Design a protein around this ligand. Structure first.
Ligand SMILES: Cc1nc(-c2ccc(CO)cc2)no1
Length: 209
């Protein structure tokens, strides 16, 4: 059972802007996704201080970066708080509407796409480099879900039958054909060092072959 949803017009407009605007500094997508992972890890860590059983689904708090040249995917995995179905379908979009409006206003005033994270909609910078994004997520209070969108105004949500994750979120970037540099170890290392040097969780860059 796959459910198909329409983005709100404002988020669809944001996604088109990210896909269509000429902007060479695409590497900032990784900083934004790592920042989102760090925030999700902060949240489960804080909740565990008053309810340690929230870590029964996994004590380790970390971020993994997994390139796969055969699939042409870059996956950003965290063991953070995860997202519920309501987050995926309703709550994220509610927060994203006001963040998008503020970001658009800033852009017309002279800001650039790299400041997207200051408006809470940094996730959508994934579409600087990805033609499709798949998000697999598991929150302690809900089932494991797969969200997916190739933009074009719609996204899907289904219950995920793949490998159970325990708790957290995997963002799978199906890279555009001309963006395969973000599968190269030295390039990912360079970007993490430049933009994500002080993240308070271990970031493991997996190696291929
Ligand atoms: C869809 C969608 N997924 C996310 C998202 C994914 C991953 C994280 C970090 O775990 C945070 C937010 N935002 O919109």
């Amino acid at each position: 059972e796959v459910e198909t949803f329409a983005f709100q017009a404002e988020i669809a407009q944001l996604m088109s802007l990210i896909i269509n605007t000429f902007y060479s500094n695409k590497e900032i997508f990784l900083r934004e996704l790592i920042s989102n992972s760090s925030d999700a890890l902060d949240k489960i860590r804080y909740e565990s201080l008053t309810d340690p059983s929230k870590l029964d689904s996994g004590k380790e708090l970390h971020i993994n970066l997994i390139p796969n040249k055969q699939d042409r995917t870059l996956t950003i995995v965290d063991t953070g708080i995860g997202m519920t179905k309501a987050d995926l379908i309703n709550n994220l979009g509610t927060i994203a509407k006001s963040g998008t409006k503020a970001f658009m206003e800033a852009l017309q005033a002279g800001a650039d796409i790299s400041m997207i994270g200051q408006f809470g909609v940094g996730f959508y910078s994934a579409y600087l480099v990805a033609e499709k994004v798949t998000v697999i997520t598991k929150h302690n209070d809900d089932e494991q879900y797969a969200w997916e969108s190739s933009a074009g105004g719609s996204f899907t949500v289904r219950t995920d039958t793949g490998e159970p994750m325990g708790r957290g979120t995997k963002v799978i970037l199906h890279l555009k054909e001309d963006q395969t540099e973000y599968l190269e170890e030295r390039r990912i290392k360079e970007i993490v060092k430049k933009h994500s040097q002080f993240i308070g969780y271990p970031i493991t860059l997996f190696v291929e072959k």
